[PDB]
Design a protein around this ligand. Structure first.
Ligand SMILES: O=c1[nH]c(=O)c2nn[nH]c2[nH]1
Ligand SMILES: O=c1[nH]c(=O)c2nn[nH]c2[nH]1
Ligand SMILES: O=c1[nH]c(=O)c2nn[nH]c2[nH]1
Ligand SMILES: O=c1[nH]c(=O)c2nn[nH]c2[nH]1
Lengths: 295, 295, 295, 295
């Protein structure tokens, strides 16, 4: 027996940072959850009880706090690249740093039409995330994403024409609820290192906003032939809007809302064109995935 | 041994209802989770195996769907009163109906500055709830609430002057983060029955909006001496704004964000006036409650 | 406006305690989550910003750790009474202490037929809880409970004879799955104070074990006419077995497992006597409650 | 733009199956949650709105129920291989089926020392899982696992000798609590198809039991130099015990339990050799991973 792969570090490190403008008196808060895992020459810590190779997970935690102290935490793609670069430069035997970041919403409150200088509201469980792999010799791989974006449309969604055989009971439809929690990931072209990540900084926030925007507009406007067909159009657009992205990936649950037949009761009419009252279903759910790259 | 109290029914009934305007083409969706429990002359179902007294929980579920079909589901205080009244009028041996409703956010999407006719976004995990107790002979008791309203302010919160003794380690402060998940309940004056609940319908949505509004403004503007002092001012205002409310109750966790001392590292300065980076704490948390009524 | 009720304290305080026998070398661990809320003369902290009346929630937390250090943490009814008594004796203006405790399972591991001296396994998410209200002048009220005890029987459960009307679609049955998560609470006769709670210590662990035992045996052996009928027999027995209990309360979800009709497929036979494959339902669920006291 | 990868199917399909012995009168229940995703020639459903290529997720759900009806559901490695093989044989354009299965514990109850014929208890949230990839032309890849196995030892764990630098604050120790939730995956040698999976059936249950056994014994007996060192010995043993396994992978959180210093209070002694009372920490946690293969 031998160690084929190994990684270790600190998960679930919650970090909050405040920015205080002295001019405006305006405060901006950033909250995130950070995971850093390291790889490198650390087999002996497993095979020989040699702790001498271990940057302790506690230190990794200390380091996240220190790096957040000395650097901007925004955009997360940058903070993650700084944090991961720190570890492979600092430690000779550490050859890869994987950093994962979840950003939590703290939206400035509007009190009486005006932006409050220092109060915020978690206006959704939507997250913005990054996965940053900083690998000695191979640059910086970044996947950014939004997740937990939950939407529904009450009509303009259809599903007909699908395979029918002796396993099929589903009826074709031309009018249905479509509801999903959107998970969208866009993978950046590999960057050569931190200087190159710094050089693209403005693209991160912007591409995020664009992926959100496009996601929301296509979902609302597409008269959807299927989840498959709708997510492809989203991914197609993000790719067209940002040349530094190599692939867009979507993962979409189909959260079913079933018609409830009420005709057994006083011939009550609640199906088809008469459907007003539905039973949202907790499970099962369709799960539909697509990776879209450049042709 | 004897039955001192008994109640039974259906919990976690998820209900979605769409309203379709033919004029505008505009759709409005309502999603909620409903719980109905009944009391009455049902001891024998427990003591004697006499199922003859049981309106089956499955039927209760059917009834929720039927009532949502025939009536408005909005405001929840009304839907709950209709649903609970239905059971005590329908069944001679059923003397109390308790209805609980959680309303889930489906906010109309804005696509390109304009309200989309049929697409929605779950723009927060904030809930609006009601508890409705419909009791034969005693009218209708209604408690409405908002919960899951998560907010933070980065400054303008203080906590000093508290008792100090040999259990105390906490340092007084004049500048701190205050963060909480707001739970606010307002209890209506007892209503004589459905006609009276119908007669106050416009007050429900409005008092809800007012409780949200006041909650948000006081949190943002109060320079808070304590959570205790801040929630009292909220409750005081809701009571002043709506005469049909007998009591306002608040339940506020204090979600602590700890300073991280970084001076052990290169004399890094991250405490007091220098605090930029904090560790949000998952637990423990202060829990602070207040019921405010009329003097 | 005035303060009608107020309570404040520390929730979600996780506590672990190890007992080390020097004789045997045997270790015993206890893990729990503790909530303490205080009431008393604390209105001014709300109405006047007077923090002088506040035992800080941070201190309450310190105190839980100190009391766990100086006293046994087992049985929880005792630890809770000590902790709550501490607060009303220590502080003149504090007149009620409410202590809630959740005990988490750490079951000694069996390695090769033998009890391991210092390794444990969380062998279930079942909890043992107490609620202790220590009120100046009124003694100590204790409710103990078990919760999260999830069970299923594949047969010997029935449900027929229930009310049928134009809301009913449910078919009577003589053979069904019954599954539930058991919540059982037994309320002790009021105790005059700590000395009296100390005097009954051996009854706490024993009555707990008896409530678990009885719950499990009745569920397995009763050929159940209904959840209602089954839980009453459980409660009836606990009351008979322990004279110091005034009431037993049960709260039982009915977690439905639906037959799946497969006859549309090659006339596959999966209903009634042929039912092998079922669809466990996440929601809705029947919820059934009973409080049983002495006749 | 083009589709680089695509998969779609049904997630969260809950399935229960009862086995009824007529001889013994003994019932055995199996509950699981199943996910099936398909790949193949389905790009057009995304790019062209061509639903003609879609085996509807609803049908996939129907099929899971049908296959559970006609086949054993145990061991999960077999059921998963049957289910995935079904899809690639049934449908010409479907070239890969991925099946994921979570098995939930339903442990036969012991009533009065004897195994009850038809009552069960969810005696832990521990899961047994499989991931089965059935790929046209490439056989059947199976990864089996156990997860959610939560354990603690109060002593016989150490952590000293680790790297120290200006990011380090952690103190070396020779006595600590070690607690983790075990995730252990063993990957089988690729099988040529269903006949070959059928031919190894008895190895599945047995290797599972062995991985559980070894996990528990090593955790309890190893005087652990580090999580790293402890998990390697587990993985080393599983590999030695079962020749059909190519790799064992472990993923172990380190759930920290912090000493609480109580000497500020009446010089109370609760650290080092005196530590009795600890604060279990919800987050952050060390996360430690290892893949072990054959040298
Ligand atoms: O077992 C451990 N391994 C580690 O890598 C580590 N880092 N801090 N504590 C630790 N404990
Ligand atoms: O045991 C039951 N009690 C009930 O009240 C009920 N209603 N539907 N199924 C039921 N089962
Ligand atoms: O607002 C607060 N109220 C309290 O009672 C308290 N106790 N510690 N910190 C606190 N903050
Ligand atoms: O959009 C959909 N795609 C699918 O593949 C499917 N299967 N059932 N319903 C469905 N809806």
């Amino acid at each position: 027996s031998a160690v084929k792969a190994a990684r270790y570090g600190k998960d679930n490190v919650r970090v909050y940072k405040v920015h205080k403008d002295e001019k405006t008196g305006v405060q901006t808060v950033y909250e995130m959850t950070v995971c850093v895992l390291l790889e490198g020459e650390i087999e002996t810590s497993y095979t020989k009880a040699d702790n001498s190779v271990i940057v302790a997970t506690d230190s990794i935690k200390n380091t996240i706090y220190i790096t957040a102290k000395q650097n901007p935490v925004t955009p997360p793609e940058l903070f993650g690249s700084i944090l991961g670069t720190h570890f492979i430069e600092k430690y000779n035997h550490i050859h890869a740093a994987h950093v994962n970041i979840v950003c939590h919403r703290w939206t400035r409150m509007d009190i009486d039409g005006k932006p409050h200088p220092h109060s915020f509201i978690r206006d959704s469980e939507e997250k913005r995330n990054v996965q940053v792999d900083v690998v000695e010799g191979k640059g910086i791989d970044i996947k950014s994403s939004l997740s937990g974006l939950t939407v529904l449309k009450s009509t303009n969604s259809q599903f007909w024409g699908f395979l029918r055989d002796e396993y099929t009971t589903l009826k074709e439809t031309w009018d249905r609820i479509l509801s999903t929690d959107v998970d969208a990931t866009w993978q950046w072209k590999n960057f050569s290192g931190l200087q190159e990540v710094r050089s693209h900084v403005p693209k991160f926030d912007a591409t995020w906003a664009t992926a959100r925007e496009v996601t929301l507009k296509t979902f609302a406007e597409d008269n959807s032939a299927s989840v498959q067909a709708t997510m492809y159009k989203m991914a197609e657009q993000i790719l067209a809007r940002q040349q530094l992205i190599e692939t867009v990936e979507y993962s979409l649950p189909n959260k079913h809302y079933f018609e409830i037949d009420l005709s057994w009761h006083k011939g009550l009419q609640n199906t088809g064109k008469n459907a007003e009252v539905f039973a949202p279903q907790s499970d099962p759910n369709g799960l539909i995935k697509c990776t879209v790259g450049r042709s």
